[PDB]
Amino acid sequence: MLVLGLNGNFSAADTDVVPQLGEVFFHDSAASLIRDGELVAAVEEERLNRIKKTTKFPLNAVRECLALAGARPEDVDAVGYYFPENHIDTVLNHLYTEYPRAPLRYSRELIRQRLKEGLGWDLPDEKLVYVPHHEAHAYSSYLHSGMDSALVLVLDGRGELHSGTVYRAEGTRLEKLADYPVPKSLGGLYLNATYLLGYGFGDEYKVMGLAPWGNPETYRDTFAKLYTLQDNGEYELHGNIMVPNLVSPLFYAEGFRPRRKGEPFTQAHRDFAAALQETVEKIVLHILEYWAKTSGHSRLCFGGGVAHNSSLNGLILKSGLFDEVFVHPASHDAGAGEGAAYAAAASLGTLERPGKRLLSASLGPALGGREQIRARLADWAPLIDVEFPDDAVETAAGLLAEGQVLGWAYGRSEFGPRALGHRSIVADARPEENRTRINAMVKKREGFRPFAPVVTAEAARDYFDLSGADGNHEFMSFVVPVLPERRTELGAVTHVDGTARVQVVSAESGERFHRLVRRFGELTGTPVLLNTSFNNNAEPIVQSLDDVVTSFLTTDLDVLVVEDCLVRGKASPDLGVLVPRFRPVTRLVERRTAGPDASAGAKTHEIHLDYDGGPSAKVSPELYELLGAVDGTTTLGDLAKTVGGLSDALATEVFALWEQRFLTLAPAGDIGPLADDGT
Amino acid sequence: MLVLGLNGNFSAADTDVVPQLGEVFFHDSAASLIRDGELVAAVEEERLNRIKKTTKFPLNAVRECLALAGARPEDVDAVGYYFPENHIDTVLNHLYTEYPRAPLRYSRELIRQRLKEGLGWDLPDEKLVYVPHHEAHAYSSYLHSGMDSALVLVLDGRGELHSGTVYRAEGTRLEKLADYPVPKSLGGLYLNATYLLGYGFGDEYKVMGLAPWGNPETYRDTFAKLYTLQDNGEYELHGNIMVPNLVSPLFYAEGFRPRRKGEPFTQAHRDFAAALQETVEKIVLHILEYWAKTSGHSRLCFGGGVAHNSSLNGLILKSGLFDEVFVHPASHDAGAGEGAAYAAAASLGTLERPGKRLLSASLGPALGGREQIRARLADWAPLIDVEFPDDAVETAAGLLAEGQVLGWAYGRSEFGPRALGHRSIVADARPEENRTRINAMVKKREGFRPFAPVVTAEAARDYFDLSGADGNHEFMSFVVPVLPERRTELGAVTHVDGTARVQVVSAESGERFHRLVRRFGELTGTPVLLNTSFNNNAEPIVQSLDDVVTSFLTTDLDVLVVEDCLVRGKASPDLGVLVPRFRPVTRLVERRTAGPDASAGAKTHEIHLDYDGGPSAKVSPELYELLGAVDGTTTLGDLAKTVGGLSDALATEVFALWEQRFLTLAPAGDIGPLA
Ligand SMILES: COc1cc2cc(c1Cl)NC(=O)C[C@H](O)/C(C)=C/[C@H](C)[C@@H](O)CC(=O)[C@H](OC)/C=C/C=C(\C)C2
Ligand SMILES: COc1cc2cc(c1Cl)NC(=O)C[C@H](O)/C(C)=C/[C@H](C)[C@@H](O)CC(=O)[C@H](OC)/C=C/C=C(\C)C2
Numbered sequence A: 001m002l003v004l005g006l007n008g009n010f011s012a013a014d015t016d017v018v019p020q021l022g023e024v025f026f027h028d029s030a031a032s033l034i035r036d037g038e039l040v041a042a043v044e045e046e047r048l049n050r051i052k053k054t055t056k057f058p059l060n061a062v063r064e065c066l067a068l069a070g071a072r073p074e075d076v077d078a079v080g081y082y083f084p085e086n087h088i089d090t091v092l093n094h095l096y097t098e099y100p101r102a103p104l105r106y107s108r109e110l111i112r113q114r115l116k117e118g119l120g121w122d123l124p125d126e127k128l129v130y131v132p133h134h135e136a137h138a139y140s141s142y143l144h145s146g147m148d149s150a151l152v153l154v155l156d157g158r159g160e161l162h163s164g165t166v167y168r169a170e171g172t173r174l175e176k177l178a179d180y181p182v183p184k185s186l187g188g189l190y191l192n193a194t195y196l197l198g199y200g201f202g203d204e205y206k207v208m209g210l211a212p213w214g215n216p217e218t219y220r221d222t223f224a225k226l227y228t229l230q231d232n233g234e235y236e237l238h239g240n241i242m243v244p245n246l247v248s249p250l251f252y253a254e255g256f257r258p259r260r261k262g263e264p265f266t267q268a269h270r271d272f273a274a275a276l277q278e279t280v281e282k283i284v285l286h287i288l289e290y291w292a293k294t295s296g297h298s299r300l301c302f303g304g305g306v307a308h309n310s311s312l313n314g315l316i317l318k319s320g321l322f323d324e325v326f327v328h329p330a331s332h333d334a335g336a337g338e339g340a341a342y343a344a345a346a347s348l349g350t351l352e353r354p355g356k357r358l359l360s361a362s363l364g365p366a367l368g369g370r371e372q373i374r375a376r377l378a379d380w381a382p383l384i385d386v387e388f389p390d391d392a393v394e395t396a397a398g399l400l401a402e403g404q405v406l407g408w409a410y411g412r413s414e415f416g417p418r419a420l421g422h423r424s425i426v427a428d429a430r431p432e433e434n435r436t437r438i439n440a441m442v443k444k445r446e447g448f449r450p451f452a453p454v455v456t457a458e459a460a461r462d463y464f465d466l467s468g469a470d471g472n473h474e475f476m477s478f479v480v481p482v483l484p485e486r487r488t489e490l491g492a493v494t495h496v497d498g499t500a501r502v503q504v505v506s507a508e509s510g511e512r513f514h515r516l517v518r519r520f521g522e523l524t525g526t527p528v529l530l531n532t533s534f535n536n537n538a539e540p541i542v543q544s545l546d547d548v549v550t551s552f553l554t555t556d557l558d559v560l561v562v563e564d565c566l567v568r569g570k571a572s573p574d575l576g577v578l579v580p581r582f583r584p585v586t587r588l589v590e591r592r593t594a595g596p597d598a599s600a601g602a603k604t605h606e607i608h609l610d611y612d613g614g615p616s617a618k619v620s621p622e623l624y625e626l627l628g629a630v631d632g633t634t635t636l637g638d639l640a641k642t643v644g645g646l647s648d649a650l651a652t653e654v655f656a657l658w659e660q661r662f663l664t665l666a667p668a669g670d671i672g673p674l675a676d677d678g679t
Numbered sequence B: 001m002l003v004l005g006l007n008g009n010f011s012a013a014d015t016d017v018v019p020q021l022g023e024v025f026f027h028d029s030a031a032s033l034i035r036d037g038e039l040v041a042a043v044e045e046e047r048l049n050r051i052k053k054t055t056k057f058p059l060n061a062v063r064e065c066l067a068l069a070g071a072r073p074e075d076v077d078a079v080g081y082y083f084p085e086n087h088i089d090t091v092l093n094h095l096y097t098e099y100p101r102a103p104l105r106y107s108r109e110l111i112r113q114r115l116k117e118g119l120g121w122d123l124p125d126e127k128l129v130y131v132p133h134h135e136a137h138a139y140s141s142y143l144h145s146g147m148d149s150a151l152v153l154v155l156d157g158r159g160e161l162h163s164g165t166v167y168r169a170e171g172t173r174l175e176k177l178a179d180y181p182v183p184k185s186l187g188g189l190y191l192n193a194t195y196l197l198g199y200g201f202g203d204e205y206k207v208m209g210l211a212p213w214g215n216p217e218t219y220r221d222t223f224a225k226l227y228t229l230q231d232n233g234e235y236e237l238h239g240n241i242m243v244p245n246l247v248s249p250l251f252y253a254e255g256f257r258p259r260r261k262g263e264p265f266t267q268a269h270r271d272f273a274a275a276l277q278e279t280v281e282k283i284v285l286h287i288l289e290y291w292a293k294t295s296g297h298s299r300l301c302f303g304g305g306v307a308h309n310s311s312l313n314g315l316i317l318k319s320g321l322f323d324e325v326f327v328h329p330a331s332h333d334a335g336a337g338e339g340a341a342y343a344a345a346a347s348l349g350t351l352e353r354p355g356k357r358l359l360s361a362s363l364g365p366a367l368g369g370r371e372q373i374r375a376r377l378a379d380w381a382p383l384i385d386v387e388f389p390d391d392a393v394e395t396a397a398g399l400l401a402e403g404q405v406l407g408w409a410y411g412r413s414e415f416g417p418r419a420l421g422h423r424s425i426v427a428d429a430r431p432e433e434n435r436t437r438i439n440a441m442v443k444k445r446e447g448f449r450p451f452a453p454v455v456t457a458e459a460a461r462d463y464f465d466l467s468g469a470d471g472n473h474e475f476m477s478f479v480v481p482v483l484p485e486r487r488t489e490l491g492a493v494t495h496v497d498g499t500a501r502v503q504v505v506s507a508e509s510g511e512r513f514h515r516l517v518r519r520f521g522e523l524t525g526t527p528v529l530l531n532t533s534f535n536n537n538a539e540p541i542v543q544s545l546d547d548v549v550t551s552f553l554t555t556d557l558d559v560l561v562v563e564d565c566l567v568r569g570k571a572s573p574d575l576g577v578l579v580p581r582f583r584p585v586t587r588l589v590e591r592r593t594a595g596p597d598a599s600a601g602a603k604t605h606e607i608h609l610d611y612d613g614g615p616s617a618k619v620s621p622e623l624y625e626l627l628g629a630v631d632g633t634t635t636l637g638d639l640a641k642t643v644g645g646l647s648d649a650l651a652t653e654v655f656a657l658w659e660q661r662f663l664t665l666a667p668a669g670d671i672g673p674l675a
């Protein structure tokens, strides 16, 4: 029983189903493979096409999943899609009314076309199963919990008909107890509010990071006009006929004006974030109080995108409403894609479930066999120096104890947004200045936001207040208080209100990462590291060896540890050996606008990425000429000869484009097919 | 007492308030000027910036209105804006949350900035009056009716709070009787359905033109699921939570697929149009049946964008519900801008109203005086031959009787969408083949589209069934039946269902055009002409003399009659003497995407117009290089030297860009300030 789970939209690599398809139209595309009821592989398409939360069809994700399973496409018994067919097709139909030149291709025909063209797979119609959206969520959240029954709450922006759903789960049976309609969306409320902070889709976590800096009392009575808690776990959100945003009209009427790009957060902005976070907490605890009492259940699984609000999750943990709480590492739509595979297996009879509670999110493609890794790092030699220590973990622990910030890349990439010891950046958690330091190091701007700690299972209760319910901490799903007498010791990872989003690593959840944190604890007396994701501000979490080396060379980390190899950048890295390649969305443009007296105006050159929200950058006439000659095989240095050679100015210009990922820059060739490592 | 009426958004000529600001965000920007209660000038900005139904701030329209009134900015006593301040600002604020780089400039600051930078006019806060949207519509529609009491119905997509409002009007006082909420919008319903036919905003009257070719039975029971008529003049529209379109989910579930652009209109599409039109007719007549008997009014004024549904209007006319019906030539938001002037005047003193019923929409800028027109036509000499007949109307009537298709441009341009004898294309109304060809060859549009007739007031009842209420036909507001015994005679202007959107012209509504139609009737026996708007498919109604001549030369017209000059295109016209100029929205781009094996793709070159819904076109590398040198003063022939001379291929390529209006091509200089 080999079942593929699919979520996302249907766009090709280089174009979208309609031009500039909005970033929220079926996002976080991913592919998941289950076999005999176990999740054998899962990866988000964003890791492979390098577009954060991409909506594009997850063709590469499917290819990677089939290879991790040793399967041909034709081996797949069924395909589950995370929305009902009529809903996705009606939304596509609406996009087609807005773009009358777009050919009428609905979801079943598009899925069949992408798989046939992209993999030579003729998918028979009877193998494609469409699934109710919150049902897919609930299966993913509950089947990995290891509980034999639970109350299951799903909250997100919306499924086909609901913004929230409540189930009772028993064995492999879901029974729906309640639902909440689309206009009551809490994910909708949170995203509406996020826009008022100069932020957008995918920035909700930054708003949650900002909330503890604010006073929730300032706007408490304003938000109280936008919701009413009601009897029997009900609630209302009070809409308006002015604009498609629940929040902006009332706040505008009271003089609140939205933050502009590059403007610093005012006290009003911090307070707004606080009252927003308090509002959603109050509503969800209202829901859960009613359904805990009504169902009588002591266990909760919480899924949907709203369940990535780890602040909310820590409040649920401390509420005493439940004895146990489980949250999946991918509770957003990538996890609904996984859940859609289980629902498809159930639809076709044979629903087999995982034998254990999920402990490791390490489920994507690996970096490769060590012989092809060694070989590929040699291709990077003009830019890096490599050491091959005898005990890389031991060396890494000492470097960390000496105060260096490390890139840490091992094995299979994490499913879901948190890095957990496979595509991570780690450093000493004690020094508070590591916050400003490592933020500048990776060109990010979340200094207001602390980093997440990782602690050994053994030491976990020596530093963190896990009490209340028994929650799962292998994925940083919960904010917990830092013990008051350890707060000053844990300066980099403790928030302004004394809390932290802790990963508890165990020998079972991640053996190598556990050994690393334990070893550092032996060396310093503090078995706590900070653990942030391995990516700069212009990319999702790095996936391949080439991605890892690129991100290392374009950030200011001290050392990279990748599959026992110690990597450092040469004193003068030779960019000229790198072969530039366009990404499928790269566009290179010379533009003339209108000028004064109706002349042809200013003539500028730019590079940009052709997707909704994609970045763009000005380029010099010289680099424009160089990049226009990119052929995918000639090196940057050889291409630069046509404009006089790779000057220091050009190399610096190229490097800044590299940092923003406008195009691929890597040595010639590639690492080759990922090795069958026998696991 | 001089009052400016304003409507539209606040964008500059070359950018929008946010990038790619949607075409429906405060559209049909216009300016109107009233003086002592009379409308002295009105023009839509689309005529001046050449962007159909533009949302850009109507800066040119204000300047032109002041010139027509002989006024300086400082003479203006007040400025009315056609929406309440809190509503437009809340929408602006929403756009600013989606575009965090946009500075927080709201409507009051934006209006004052545009008038200061654009006209040197410092507008005091106390002179800017914001007006409820349907109130503005109602003043415009009622005060021009010549009625001293009436029921006034406003139906559009939405105002600030309502999709529909019903007023009692008596003297100069409006009293609200009823309103209908935003989700009951009939304008929204019609636009939602328009999108299923491969059309967009602005195409509603094409759907209306399609409907008589369909059978409303096919989809009658489908549309019946989308609305319910209720007691005492009420109704409901039944929404959905799947997509922001009332119509498309149900019709998708029943197997109806949206038409693609550039594909035929099938019988299912025609049937869909017919059932939509019947649906809106049923709802509006339900509303009006109730409010006619309840309010006790024998006379109706109907405004809002829905009142440009001339089929609906003709049914209202035949319903027997009213004795008289009036519809303003600009019943869409440009007319709400005019109404906002009357409201602003009412808020700062007693309201002065027009003395008489409006008979003429000839209210925009004229073409110029005789001397400057003749001199400017001399600038076009390398492209045109010009004759100066003793009696140009006599001559034009003869050319029409001989089968010629004429451009006709005289005096001040029409306010509102219909051409009425000031910026018109006219032809013999008798041969059905004229409809076939003027659709296919001249306007280049769909073969199903009707053509509208103009008839003399003296002969109107010889050809059209005007029975029922007394409606005003000076602006083609009403579809009426063509008398059965005249349908064969009027082959080009009788629609498939035997009706026509008639203009009745009189010596009082348009003396010159009436003389033309009457003389044609004396020559042929038939005092009826085909009258379509003077524009190709890439442009709004032509405004200036250069606009008129450019449009004549790029559409297949036989002859142009412009202010008594007979213009024909030269045998071999010299495009090399035209001076290319960029429009403020013209853009030129050389572009590479990705190519095979992650290479840079092959370069392509394009010209496009930078606004939401703007066209684009590929251009040769040679023309790309030529257009990059455009300076606004050098001729096309001189510019082409740098690419080795204006070859035949380059002239042909340039001509096709000119026809789509990607750039301005006109002789050196301009006509000067209009005399
Ligand atoms: C212009 O056309 C629209 C616009 C909206 C709605 C719909 C349509 Cl057709 N109609 C739907 O049905 C939405 C659909 O199901 C969908 C994209 C679901 C994904 C998988 C959710 O994850 C997204 C969200 O929840 C999102 O916030 C992040 C809310 C977006 C609402 C909107 C973007 C408003
Ligand atoms: C994404 O942001 C939106 C979107 C919508 C609505 C609003 C907002 Cl903020 N909220 C409004 O209030 C609209 C406002 O009042 C307005 C533009 C009024 C003009 C003058 C009307 O003429 C337009 C129409 O009637 C139009 O179809 C032609 C309907 C468009 C509705 C929409 C395109 C849906």
Ligand SMILES: NC(=O)OP(=O)(O)OC[C@H]1O[C@@H](n2cnc3c(N)ncnc32)[C@H](O)[C@@H]1O
Pocket: A028, A133, A155, A156, A157, A158, A159, A186, A187, A188, A190, A191, A204, A205, A208, A304, A305, A306, A307, A308, A309, A310, A331, A332, A333, A334
């Ligand atoms: N079908 C569907 O809706 O997709 P989905 O399961 O992937 O959840 C996305 C939603 O979770 C919301 N969301 C994401 N992070 C959030 C956070 N930290 N707090 C609140 N809401 C959040 C986000 O704003 C968005 O509304």
Ligand SMILES: NC(=O)OP(=O)(O)OC[C@H]1O[C@@H](n2cnc3c(N)ncnc32)[C@H](O)[C@@H]1O
Pocket: B028, B133, B155, B156, B157, B158, B159, B186, B187, B188, B190, B191, B204, B205, B208, B304, B305, B306, B308, B309, B310, B331, B332, B333, B334
């Ligand atoms: N504030 C506001 O809404 O502006 P507005 O007065 O300018 O009218 C626009 C509305 O008239 C509708 N509309 C335009 N032509 C129409 C037609 N022939 N039939 C029905 N609706 C029409 C159009 O679809 C749109 O919904």
Ligand SMILES: [Fe+3]
Pocket: A133, A137, A156, A157, A158, A159, A304, A305, A332, A333, A336
């Ligand atoms: Fe979801």
Ligand SMILES: [Fe+3]
Pocket: B133, B137, B156, B157, B158, B304, B305, B332, B333, B336
């Ligand atoms: Fe209106």
